Amino acid sequence: MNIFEMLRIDEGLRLKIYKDTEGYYTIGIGHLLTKSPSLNAAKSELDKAIGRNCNGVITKDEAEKLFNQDVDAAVRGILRNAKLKPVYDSLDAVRRCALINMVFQMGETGVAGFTNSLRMLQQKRWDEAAVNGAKSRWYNQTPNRAKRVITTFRTGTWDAYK
Ligand SMILES: [Cl-]
Ligand SMILES: [Cl-]
Numbered sequence: 001m002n003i004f005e006m007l008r009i010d011e012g013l014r015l016k017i018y019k020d021t022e023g024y025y026t027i028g029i030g031h032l033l034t035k036s037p038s039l040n041a042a043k044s045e046l047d048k049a050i051g052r053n054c055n056g057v058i059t060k061d062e063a064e065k066l067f068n069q070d071v072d073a074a075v076r077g078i079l080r081n082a083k084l085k086p087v088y089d090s091l092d093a094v095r096r097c098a099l100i101n102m103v104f105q106m107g108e109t110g111v112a113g114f115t116n117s118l119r120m121l122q123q124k125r126w127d128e129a130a131v132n133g134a135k136s137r138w139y140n141q142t143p144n145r146a147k148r149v150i151t152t153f154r155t156g157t158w159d160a161y162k
Contacts, residue, residue: 001158003071003097007104009161010145013063017042017056021142027056028063030104031070074104083112090122098152105145106138121153130154 011030017039020026025033025042033045039056047054050062058066078084078099088096099121102111111118114136120129130150133139139146151160 001161003100004067006097006158006161007067007071007101010101010105010148013060015058015060015063017046027058027066029067029070031063031066070104071100074100077108078103081108081112083118084108087118087122090124092156094156094158095121095153098149101149101152110138126154126156 008029013029014027017025017027017033020030020032024035025039025045027033027046031049033042033049036042043054043056046056046058049066050058078088084099084103088099091099099111102114114133117129117133120132130153133150133153134146136146139150148160152158
């Protein structure tokens with residue numbers, strides 16, 4: 001199990017514009033296109049993003065291309081962030097995947113908002129951080145995916161994904 005396979009389980013794959021769990025226009029493997037209500041704002045961003053006239057539909061290849069970009073951007077974002085980087089550095093390989101997952105889903109700004117949980121991860125208090133992280137909108141909104149990521153942090157294994 002790796003970060004790609006983990007996120008692919010959590011986000012799914014869709015070759016046609018769709019709405020995310022928050023009502024936002026998305027495509028492929030969790031690639032948010034726009035928070036705007038307009039399907040046209042969405043189709044536009046989509047062509048801008050692929051380099052072609054897509055008319056709201058893309059190929060597997062294109063979805064995977066977008067996915068490679070986003071994981072890379074998530075990882076470079078963590079490494080540039082003064083609040084996230086020390087946390088990442090302190091972690092083992094599995095838990096590092098868990099923080100990448102949160103960052104891909106909720107953006108750097110949103111995870112950086114989990115001040116308390118981050119401090120506990122950093123101090124290696126697994127159980128405490130799992131409990132605190134569950135007290136969030138995130139957990140209340142996508143509970144199954146949140147539980148999966150939270151277990152990854154608690155245990156340091158891929159159990160929740162197998
Ligand atoms: Cl809460
Ligand atoms: Cl969920």
